[PDB]
Amino acid sequence: MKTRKGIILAGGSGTRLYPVTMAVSQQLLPIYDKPMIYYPLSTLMLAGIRDILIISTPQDTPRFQQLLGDGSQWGLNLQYKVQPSPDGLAQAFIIGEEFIGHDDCALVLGDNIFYGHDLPKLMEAAVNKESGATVFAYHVNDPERYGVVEFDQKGTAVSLEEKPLQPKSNYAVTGLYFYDNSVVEMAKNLKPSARGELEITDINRIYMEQGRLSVAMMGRGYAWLDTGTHQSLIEASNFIATIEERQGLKVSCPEEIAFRKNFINAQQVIELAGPLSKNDYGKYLLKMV
Amino acid sequence: MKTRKGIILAGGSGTRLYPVTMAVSQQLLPIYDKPMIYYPLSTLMLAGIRDILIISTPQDTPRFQQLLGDGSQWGLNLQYKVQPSPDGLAQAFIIGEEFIGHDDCALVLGDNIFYGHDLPKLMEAAVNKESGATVFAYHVNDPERYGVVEFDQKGTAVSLEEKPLQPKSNYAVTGLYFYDNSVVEMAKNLKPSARGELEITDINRIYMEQGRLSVAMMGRGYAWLDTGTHQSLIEASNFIATIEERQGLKVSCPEEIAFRKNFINAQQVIELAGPLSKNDYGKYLLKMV
Amino acid sequence: MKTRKGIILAGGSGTRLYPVTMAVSQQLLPIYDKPMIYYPLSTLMLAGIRDILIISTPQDTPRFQQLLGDGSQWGLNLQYKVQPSPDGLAQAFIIGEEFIGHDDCALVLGDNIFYGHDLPKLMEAAVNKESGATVFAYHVNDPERYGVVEFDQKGTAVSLEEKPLQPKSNYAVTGLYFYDNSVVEMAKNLKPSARGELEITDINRIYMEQGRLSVAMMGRGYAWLDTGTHQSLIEASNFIATIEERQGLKVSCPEEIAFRKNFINAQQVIELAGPLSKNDYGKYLLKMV
Amino acid sequence: MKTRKGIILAGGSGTRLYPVTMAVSQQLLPIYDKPMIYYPLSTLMLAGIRDILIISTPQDTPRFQQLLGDGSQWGLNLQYKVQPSPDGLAQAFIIGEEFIGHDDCALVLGDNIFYGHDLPKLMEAAVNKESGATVFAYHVNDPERYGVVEFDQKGTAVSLEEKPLQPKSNYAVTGLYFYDNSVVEMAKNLKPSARGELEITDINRIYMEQGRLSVAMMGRGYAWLDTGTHQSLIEASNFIATIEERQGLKVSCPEEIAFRKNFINAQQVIELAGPLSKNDYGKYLLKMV
Ligand SMILES: Cc1cn([C@H]2C[C@H](O)[C@@H](COP(=O)(O)OP(=O)(O)OP(=O)(O)O)O2)c(=O)[nH]c1=O
Numbered sequence A, B, C, D: 001m002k003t004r005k006g007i008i009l010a011g012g013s014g015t016r017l018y019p020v021t022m023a024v025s026q027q028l029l030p031i032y033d034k035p036m037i038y039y040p041l042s043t044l045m046l047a048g049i050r051d052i053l054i055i056s057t058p059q060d061t062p063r064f065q066q067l068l069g070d071g072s073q074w075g076l077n078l079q080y081k082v083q084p085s086p087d088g089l090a091q092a093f094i095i096g097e098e099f100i101g102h103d104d105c106a107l108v109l110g111d112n113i114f115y116g117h118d119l120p121k122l123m124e125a126a127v128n129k130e131s132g133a134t135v136f137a138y139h140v141n142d143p144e145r146y147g148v149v150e151f152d153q154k155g156t157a158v159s160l161e162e163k164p165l166q167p168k169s170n171y172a173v174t175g176l177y178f179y180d181n182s183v184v185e186m187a188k189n190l191k192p193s194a195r196g197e198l199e200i201t202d203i204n205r206i207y208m209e210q211g212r213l214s215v216a217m218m219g220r221g222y223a224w225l226d227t228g229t230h231q232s233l234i235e236a237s238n239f240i241a242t243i244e245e246r247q248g249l250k251v252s253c254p255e256e257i258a259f260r261k262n263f264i265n266a267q268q269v270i271e272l273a274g275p276l277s278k279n280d281y282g283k284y285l286l287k288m289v
């Protein structure tokens, strides 16, 4: 079965971005010309995932709901659910248990921005895996902040460590994961770590130990950004602005992606673009069709 | 009488920023490391103004209230009032009539960033002005978007025009205004312009016609920025980032300004910083004391 | 025959960048952390091309020679030749006639930056092409500045126009070209255009008219940037900075590419890095091995 | 006597910016739209200094000479001299001894960028000091890299330390200094420090100990940037670009400054702008007059 369900974890406390996240969800902050959540949303769409559960805080879940609605305007089926407190990424599968049911499911972090040639191609392989799980390894400047994958001399991934003191490599596990149905049972049996969180890295270690984990390499030609600090947030925005100004094309425009994947037709695009044509966003869409 | 009351117009529509501003007020958007409204708030505070009225939309007013509270944490007296519809800058004096009472009052637009050596000094002259009004003239590249001031050969401001098809100069009127109590009656008597808005420029033209308007020059040494477009918003963030990274000092940090102007003392800063010391903002405040 | 020779057109006038380019060649300007010419040089190297001719102005050729030497430090064979006057891109094949001999040859503009996942792969098809030529089509916002390709309903490129008043599409021809040996005779027979230049576009039109031109699409997933204006130059630098800061990996580092493609081995890298280990570039190279 | 002579130290090895400074002097690198040296040059001009000695490396001194000439086109008198090796900032006064003669003299580092309201006013005070010296203290993020000034509780500067291990404050001494004639004798008697350089900080300590040093504060409202790293270089450029795009005015344009200070007239500006009107720089100047 092709993965057809996805969860966007869009909550957290956002303490590092304080005070910008004091009155606005990190996932609603702009990345140049569109809300941050539009990016991970576009990533799932490109992967062919149209049934998506969005999870956020008790305060912000209603806000995403208000901005996105049921997502039928983009040919999607959006559902919402609250995570009482940011107790860990793995909790996404406990909260989303009903939604997931007996199906495979992808997980993408609400602040993750992916961009690059063949990204869709890269995700399809994971989407079509009958069972097991697929995560992606990306070379980053400071491994210590993430789940770090260790490889042997042959290039085989042999272990994963959450925020190691001494990273065994500079390869971090990205915020995009693809799982078969067994992840729900794994999450339910996890016990909090010393830092009191349900670790998704423990989930991934389990798949690895069962020999069911594909650590797909996401090359340097791809861009994987997260907006962890004020600094990285602005760099991400400059990155996006440069590409869009140069190409005259938009990065992660859901309306566009839905149109090109035939989720909606030109008439639907025209209606959505109407209210947005007082600036380039809407004019872009009108021109697109 | 020194101007001791101020109003921040923090509402509006933000069409030029859709869909960014669909689910986030322009004034809540981050400008590098803090919400946009911290800048105009700081500008008033630096002028010695502590009693401030915050006006926004029906939906966003409560959000600013949640973000700022009554402002006592910073030695301020903040109040809030809703602007039913974004019918014009001048409407700020109608909505804020009770708040203003019989006193002088300043108005600053929520998306305006002012920065420069001796900015406090420049404002102090306006703050101490007995009667009449003071506005500021700043040289910009696209004057047509603003209220534009015409000067005669001697350099005396002789007329103002809102968005003229043909600017008589490249000097725009900034979003910081100081008025005496007569502005309230002026606003109550304005008729909407062809574009259906109560024009702050008509108020300024009235003071100028009565010979009561001081058009103070705000030189090139100062930075006056707007964040109405994707472009201006990212440029402002980069601008602020450069300054702060270099100085190790923050631009428009309310806690810091409140401390340096003795609105609050060290213990209060220490108390505010504690629960925030986990992020750089907290560390910044502790280093300060 | 695989394309094993390349030419970098690194001269020109740079009027749009005066006075920046009055005392510094556009190709010597930094793009974040390395001179501009390192990028096109890397592009050729990634295509497996080691024998490269660098063409510049009478004044600047010696500077590039001092910067790059004979390239043996990176397992390359670099040569230099002066372009008396910036009389057109196509003049590159007249000046480089002896260098080319009877072989195939690639041409890359000195101010062109290419980046993206699988870029090497895309070039390899051109590199292996038996005869004819290959150029790349990229979607941009201001096509009028470039050679523009027209496609029919089926998507087949049917015509090219240099700076048309009315672009027939938004696809510009990039600054990376692959040619068979017949390009030399074509260039020697060109007559200057009304703007008095030997047009590379006329050469491309010739291959297209003989049905020997492959117009390969370079998708939105790739970044193709120019640095002809103040604006494009700073945007490119910010673009590169974001990528590198995030990855802890450098874009177009000749030493690294030479190492990864086995042009040189570890000892050589270690020897080059030693005297540079005092700065981050040296540290970067040592970390690499 | 008003200081009427100035020296721009524009040499050094630039190792930190390697490889960008391998084939281009750090002082010829662009800062958005003009060579870096145009900035310190503009600073001396604003201070009323028209007789300036430019010092660089054996290789680059001729390049500045070629770009700037005798500077009479801007109403200046430029002289050039080589510093065999970067043996320290204080060496500027030994090399420039003949040039200085019996007069007072200012020193500005070739990579220093100063900007802010009243900068000229700030410098005039130092320019008019009969004797002694004036340096400026600026709060920076990392004091350790500069000469650091320690102050007592009253705000009086009491000591200076070059690159202290434990900075006694976050105030660094900027790259702009104003001296009376006694600095030449001081420089001649200095002995190299442990790091083998003639320290300008020892010069400044001498003035301080003789009670002849004015440590003028350069407030946070001013911007003082140096382009030490690739990162700071790009931030400086973004800073300049934002201000210029917003104001429609240029920062540190020598042609403009010479015109406004009446060093040259409109006709001279028109002639210089002619060759530069293929881009905004020249058009700016033409419009200016
Ligand atoms: C942990 C945790 C994170 N998040 C989502 C929010 C982010 O988009 C994504 C990334 O993890 P984090 O970035 O670390 O989320 P965070 O906001 O807690 O970061 P910090 O407070 O240190 O600044 O995960 C949740 O929704 N729930 C959670 O329980």
Ligand SMILES: Cc1cn([C@H]2C[C@H](O)[C@@H](COP(=O)(O)OP(=O)(O)OP(=O)(O)O)O2)c(=O)[nH]c1=O
Residues within 6 Å of the ligand: A217, A218, A219, A220, A221, A222, C042, C046, C114, C115, C116, C117, C118, C119, C120, C121, C250, C251, C252, C253, C256, C257, C260
């Ligand atoms: C390898 C390598 C690639 N490149 C740039 C060239 C391409 O635009 C981009 C991608 O080339 P590719 O390496 O072939 O694509 P990749 O994303 O698979 O890279 P990897 O898996 O090895 O991390 O990287 C370099 O600049 N330096 C290098 O050392």
Ligand SMILES: Cc1cn([C@H]2C[C@H](O)[C@@H](COP(=O)(O)OP(=O)(O)OP(=O)(O)O)O2)c(=O)[nH]c1=O
Residues within 6 Å of the ligand: B009, B010, B011, B012, B013, B014, B015, B016, B017, B026, B027, B055, B056, B083, B085, B086, B087, B088, B089, B091, B109, B110, B111, B112, B228
């Ligand atoms: C008009 C109007 C503006 N504003 C404040 C919001 C902004 O901070 C400041 C500047 O006004 P504008 O920016 O021009 O109003 P806007 O936010 O609707 O922008 P757009 O053209 O994209 O729709 O004035 C109000 O609060 N109330 C109003 O009635």
Ligand SMILES: Cc1cn([C@H]2C[C@H](O)[C@@H](COP(=O)(O)OP(=O)(O)OP(=O)(O)O)O2)c(=O)[nH]c1=O
Residues within 6 Å of the ligand: B217, B218, B219, B220, B221, B222, D042, D046, D114, D115, D116, D117, D118, D119, D120, D121, D250, D251, D252, D253, D256, D257, D260
């Ligand atoms: C005049 C002038 C100043 N400057 C820079 C130097 C200072 O850092 C900054 C401000 O110096 P000042 O010009 O004297 O301050 P200002 O803000 O009053 O400028 P004005 O009223 O003339 O618009 O401007 C230039 O770069 N070019 C110029 O032509």
Ligand SMILES: Cc1cn([C@H]2C[C@H](O)[C@@H](COP(=O)(O)OP(=O)(O)OP(=O)(O)O)O2)c(=O)[nH]c1=O
Residues within 6 Å of the ligand: C009, C010, C011, C012, C013, C014, C015, C016, C017, C026, C027, C055, C056, C083, C085, C086, C087, C088, C089, C091, C109, C110, C111, C112, C228
């Ligand atoms: C024309 C021409 C360009 N060039 C190279 C330089 C650039 O890297 C690349 C792009 O050409 P252009 O950039 O358009 O040439 P230019 O540098 O003169 O730009 P400007 O319009 O500001 O004067 O081609 C040459 O080397 N020789 C030439 O005869």
Ligand SMILES: Cc1cn([C@H]2C[C@H](O)[C@@H](COP(=O)(O)OP(=O)(O)OP(=O)(O)O)O2)c(=O)[nH]c1=O
Residues within 6 Å of the ligand: A042, A046, A114, A115, A116, A117, A118, A119, A120, A121, A250, A251, A252, A253, A256, A257, A260, C217, C218, C219, C220, C221, C222
């Ligand atoms: C199509 C499409 C892709 N993408 C992003 C997703 C990927 O990171 C990147 C490239 O995916 P791909 O589109 O499949 O790669 P491409 O370079 O071949 O694109 P094309 O030939 O259609 O111009 O573009 C969008 O943001 N919006 C879109 O409408």
Ligand SMILES: Cc1cn([C@H]2C[C@H](O)[C@@H](COP(=O)(O)OP(=O)(O)OP(=O)(O)O)O2)c(=O)[nH]c1=O
Residues within 6 Å of the ligand: D009, D010, D011, D012, D013, D014, D015, D016, D017, D026, D027, D055, D056, D083, D085, D086, D087, D088, D089, D091, D109, D110, D111, D112, D228
């Ligand atoms: C030391 C020294 C510096 N310089 C000038 C060059 C710079 O504009 C200015 C600033 O000092 P530095 O910046 O440290 O000069 P640098 O190029 O040696 O820096 P680094 O090699 O560590 O990257 O001083 C000289 O001209 N001569 C000298 O002897």
Ligand SMILES: Cc1cn([C@H]2C[C@H](O)[C@@H](COP(=O)(O)OP(=O)(O)OP(=O)(O)O)O2)c(=O)[nH]c1=O
Residues within 6 Å of the ligand: B042, B046, B114, B115, B116, B117, B118, B119, B120, B121, B250, B251, B252, B253, B256, B257, B260, D217, D218, D219, D220, D221, D222
């Ligand atoms: C003090 C202070 C000023 N400001 C901004 C407001 C002004 O635009 C700019 C300059 O205000 P001023 O402080 O009066 O000018 P300054 O350059 O003399 O500052 P100082 O000597 O104290 O370092 O700094 C803050 O944002 N926060 C602060 O805590």
